[PDB]
Amino acid sequence: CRVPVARAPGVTYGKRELTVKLHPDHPTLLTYRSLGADPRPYEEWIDRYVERT
Amino acid sequence: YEHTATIPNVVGFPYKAHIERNGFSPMTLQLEVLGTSLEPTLNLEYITCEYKTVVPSPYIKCCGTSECRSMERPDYQCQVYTGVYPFMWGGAYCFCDTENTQLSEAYVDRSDVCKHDHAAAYKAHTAAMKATIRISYGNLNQTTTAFVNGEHTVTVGGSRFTFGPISTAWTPFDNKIVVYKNDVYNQDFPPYGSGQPGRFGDIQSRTVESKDLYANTALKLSRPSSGTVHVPYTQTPSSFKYWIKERGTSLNDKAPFGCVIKTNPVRAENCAVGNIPVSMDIPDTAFTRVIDAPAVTNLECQVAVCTHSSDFGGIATLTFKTDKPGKCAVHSHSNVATIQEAAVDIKTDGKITLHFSTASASPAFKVSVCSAKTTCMAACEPPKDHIVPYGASHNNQVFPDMSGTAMTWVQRVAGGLGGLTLAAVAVLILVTCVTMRR
Ligand SMILES: *[C@@H]1O[C@H](CO)[C@@H](O[C@@H]2O[C@H](CO)[C@@H](O[C@@H]3O[C@H](CO[C@H]4O[C@H](CO)[C@@H](O)[C@H](O)[C@@H]4O)[C@@H](O)[C@H](O[C@H]4O[C@H](CO)[C@@H](O)[C@H](O)[C@@H]4O)[C@@H]3O)[C@H](O)[C@H]2NC(C)=O)[C@H](O)[C@H]1NC(C)=O
Numbered sequence A: 001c002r003v004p005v006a007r008a009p010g011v012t013y014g015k016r017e018l019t020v021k022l023h024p025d026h027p028t029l030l031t032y033r034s035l036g037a038d039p040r041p042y043e044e045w046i047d048r049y050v051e052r053t
Numbered sequence B: 001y002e003h004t005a006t007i008p009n010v011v012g013f014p015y016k017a018h019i020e021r022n023g024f025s026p027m028t029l030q031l032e033v034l035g036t037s038l039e040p041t042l043n044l045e046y047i048t049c050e051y052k053t054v055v056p057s058p059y060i061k062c063c064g065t066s067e068c069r070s071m072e073r074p075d076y077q078c079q080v081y082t083g084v085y086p087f088m089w090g091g092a093y094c095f096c097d098t099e100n101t102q103l104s105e106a107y108v109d110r111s112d113v114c115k116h117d118h119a120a121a122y123k124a125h126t127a128a129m130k131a132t133i134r135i136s137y138g139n140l141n142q143t144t145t146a147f148v149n150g151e152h153t154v155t156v157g158g159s160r161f162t163f164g165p166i167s168t169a170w171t172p173f174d175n176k177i178v179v180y181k182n183d184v185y186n187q188d189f190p191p192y193g194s195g196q197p198g199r200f201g202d203i204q205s206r207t208v209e210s211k212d213l214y215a216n217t218a219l220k221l222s223r224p225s226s227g228t229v230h231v232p233y234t235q236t237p238s239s240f241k242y243w244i245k246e247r248g249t250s251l252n253d254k255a256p257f258g259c260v261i262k263t264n265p266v267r268a269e270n271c272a273v274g275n276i277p278v279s280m281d282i283p284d285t286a287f288t289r290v291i292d293a294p295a296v297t298n299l300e301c302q303v304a305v306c307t308h309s310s311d312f313g314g315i316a317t318l319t320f321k322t323d324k325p326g327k328c329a330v331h332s333h334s335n336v337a338t339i340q341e342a343a344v345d346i347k348t349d350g351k352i353t354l355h356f357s358t359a360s361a362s363p364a365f366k367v368s369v370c371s372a373k374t375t376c377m378a379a380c381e382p383p384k385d386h387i388v389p390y391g392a393s394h395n396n397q398v399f400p401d402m403s404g405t406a407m408t409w410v411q412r413v414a415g416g417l418g419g420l421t422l423a424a425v426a427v428l429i430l431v432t433c434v435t436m437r438r
Helices: B238-247 B405-434
Strands: A011-015 A017-021 A029-030 A042-046 B001-006 B015-019 B028-032 B038-040 B046-048 B053-056 B078-079 B102-109 B119-122 B127-129 B134-137 B140-143 B153-156 B159-163 B177-179 B276-282 B296-303 B318-321 B367-369 B374-376
Touching: A011 B028, A017 B127, A042 B177, B053 B102, B078 B102
Parallel strands: none
Antiparallel strands: A011 A017, A029 A042, B001 B276, B015 B028, B028 B134, B038 B127, B046 B119, B119 B177, B134 B140, B153 B159, B159 B276, B296 B318, B367 B374
């Protein structure tokens, strides 16, 4: 089949923190996890212009 | 010749092992892992598809009656009614007012695409880790694969290696596994013969093609209404289409140690845990005799830069008194810095350059070039970039040795009041030996 890609999100580097800026055109999915001893999964259907850390 | 070592498990991390023996030049190795799978020892408990209920055409009878059948079928249920008045399309259909029954029948089985898409349920009790280490020494680069347990043995060129057991026995799975198409789910599935309607496991067959289907989808077969010809029923919906939506994530998106989870020979490739022991069997026709090696005297190192960056952010400079050109093999006798490239080419003038990488403010590593050693000390500075796209090449060690500037002030407080404490003792020793007797 065929599926569109999302825009590349803008990032801003901080001390032990990463602020990423998001831009959807339709409901897309977000997932990150810490690849160390203990994972911390987060998942949310982003709908509008938001901004996360 | 025999030699053992242990390597950390992180992928893309060239490790150096050092070999010393009497009568030959020292020699360094370069082990570097390139991939690691982890297959559990599967056995299919069952397999799950999306069912298909087949309601055939309802058989009326216009004057007589009919009876039940009691056929053999997974969720079979048929039951007959009293007199019904069909009234099909033009006028009536049996041309009486009563005593005309309508037998109804329905059952369930597996799908028609059940051999194409399916969830597969396994059990992970043991696991056998493979690997893809490449091996570098002299003028020889090979790449071999081996089951990582302490008995399989592979050969490389003219030498032989074997890899010991994995240190821990940790699995990213658990004893339960659910494999649909590209996403193993670490969920405790309900067992065989105890399926529940609506939730995952409503239809269950032991293998891909067999008889003896198992199903309880709560098929209920109600009574037909006024004069139309239809067989009505009611049923709990397909569980497997709830589980395609109500699946939260995969296990690829909540795996513990940062490991991708492939699916077809169900795998757990590229984990990061523990360490791997090795065993060497390098024969004698790989070294150089000590006469043929270039003699090195009077080493002296002198650092230049030393930042704390995760790559090789440090350049040292060494001087020496050689006698002939050749090719040495450098090594670091500490876990504080890791010298890169391991294979310098000595020339007539006494000047070479290296590249190392630390993680603390003051190192104390010591360098051997060709059977001759010296010690290096540096004053290092922290970097500026906060988030880096690559990993970590050093070892995680933050401790100034004994003579760093941050620890020099400790000895000028320890020797100060500590030397004054014994001076307050030495007054009391004189008093408790002169005027305990006079
Ligand atoms: C030791 O063993 C190997 C046996 O293969 C030999 O050394 C290998 O040599 C091959 C090439 O012959 C190396 O493979 C390729 O090297 C290319 C050169 O790298 C330059 O470009 C990259 C990219 O900009 C720079 O980062 C780098 O600094 C160099 O300027 C790479 O371009 C190749 O990239 C490929 O893979 C990447 C993903 O990693 C893809 O994105 C690319 O599109 C491309 O497909 C590739 O890396 C290989 O790295 C060498 N292995 C070593 C040194 O271990 C030697 O012959 C052998 N030793 C002796 C003495 O014989």
